[PDB]
Design a protein around this ligand. Structure first.
Ligand SMILES: CN[C@@H]1[C@@H](O)[C@@H](O[C@@H]2[C@@H](O)[C@H](O[C@H]3O[C@H]([C@@H](C)NC)CC[C@H]3N)[C@@H](N)C[C@H]2N)OC[C@]1(C)O
Ligand SMILES: Nc1nc2c(ncn2[C@@H]2O[C@H](COP(=O)(O)OP(=O)(O)NP(=O)(O)O)[C@@H](O)[C@H]2O)c(=O)[nH]1
Ligand SMILES: [Cl-]
Ligand SMILES: [Mg+2]
Length: 301
């Protein structure tokens, strides 16, 4: 919070300016990202906002995805439904009715009965099955090639800071690139994926059932494996590897060992992704964090 509550005031002003008949009675910051801030307005609406950003056309795609899904999905699981939007280079805002519920965490999962956990898993698999099964023709432009993206990111590294890196850093990168070249995990089914499908985006109702999913801001047509990456993740923020496995078995018709290889490859990539983000957005701290993380990983066992 600020002394002038300046942030909330500016955003109040912008919301009321751009959405002619919209009246802000209350407004608080409910989240923030790398270059975004999310607000809860009138205890009822979520407004996601961003100023000038490296990924332009970002809130436009995300909007198009919400519209495609609200038209085409048949599910009881809620997702954002965009009522207000303002999109420009210098400012983008998306407003939708807040989905009510509690975000899944490791702690909450641990308190659930075995059966509750099973049902949650079933609900997740069933949603992913339905989304991955959609004919995505009407959003065929929202395509993401991860391998190619990584190859282009590697070139950017080589054109920028690569020569200043340590040998240890270089070896980490090259060793990953060799793995990227040898793997077959990009050669499988492509489909519409959420693509940031981690438990901080999953909402539970009062019966610990899946009631909503948020933040399709990275969604697109991509490898089917993508949506299992965080479900398979072993970390403090995610539930655990067995959670993802079970979900994969419920989901069915998918090579689990390849999903894991996909996840493991993306995990290996994370510090490099972090470096790249720092380069592209001119934020040194990200470059430094990624490089340090390479050393932590190098010295792990
Ligand atoms: C903006 N969407 C995601 C971003 O949220 C972030 O994804 C995070 C992702 O970074 C996070 O995992 C990474 O970061 C973990 C921790 C440092 N997160 C703060 C440690 C493990 C590592 N795989 C996941 N547990 C949750 C996931 N939503 O990175 C990729 C991305 C495309 O920028
Ligand atoms: N309860 C609830 N919270 C929401 C909803 N939409 C957004 N939020 C809150 O706002 C936060 C930020 O929303 P989100 O779409 O994830 O923002 P973002 O700009 O894409 N950031 P990031 O991609 O890093 O998660 C969420 O973590 C959550 O706290 C919603 O419908 N319901
Ligand atoms: Cl640095
Ligand atoms: Mg997001």
């Amino acid at each position: 919070y600020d002394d002038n509550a300046t942030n909330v005031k500016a955003m109040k002003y912008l919301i009321e300016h751009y959405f002619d008949n919209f009246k802000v009675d209350s407004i608080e910051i409910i989240g923030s990202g790398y270059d975004s801030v999310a607000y809860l307005v009138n205890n009822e609406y979520i407004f996601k906002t961003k100023f000038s950003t490296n990924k332009k056309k970002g809130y436009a795609k995300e909007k198009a995805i919400y519209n495609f899904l609200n038209t085409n999905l048949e599910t009881n699981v809620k997702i954002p439904n965009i009522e207000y939007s303002y999109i420009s280079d210098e400012l983008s805002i998306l407003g939708y009715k807040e989905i009510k519920g509690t975000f899944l965490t490791p702690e909450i999962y641990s308190t659930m009965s075995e059966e509750e956990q099973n049902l949650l898993k079933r609900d997740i698999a069933s949603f992913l099955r339905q989304m991955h099964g959609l004919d995505y023709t009407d959003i065929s432009e929202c395509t993401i090639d991860n391998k190619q993206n990584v190859l282009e990111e590697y070139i950017l590294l080589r054109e920028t800071i690569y020569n200043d890196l340590t040998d240890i850093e270089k070896d980490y990168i090259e060793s990953f690139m060799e793995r990227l070249n040898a793997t077959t995990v990009f050669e499988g089914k492509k489909c519409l994926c959420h693509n940031d499908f981690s438990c901080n985006h999953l909402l539970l109702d009062g019966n610990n059932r899946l009631t909503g999913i948020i933040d399709f801001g990275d969604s697109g047509i991509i490898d089917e494996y993508c949506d299992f990456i965080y479900l398979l993740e072993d970390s403090e923020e995610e539930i655990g590897t067995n959670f993802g496995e079970d979900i994969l078995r419920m989901y069915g018709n998918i090579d689990i060992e390849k999903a894991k290889e996909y996840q493991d490859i993306v995990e290996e990539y994370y510090p490099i992704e972090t470096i790249v983000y720092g380069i592209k957005n001119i934020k040194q701290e990200f470059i430094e964090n990624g490089r340090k993380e390479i050393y932590k990983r190098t010295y792990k066992d």
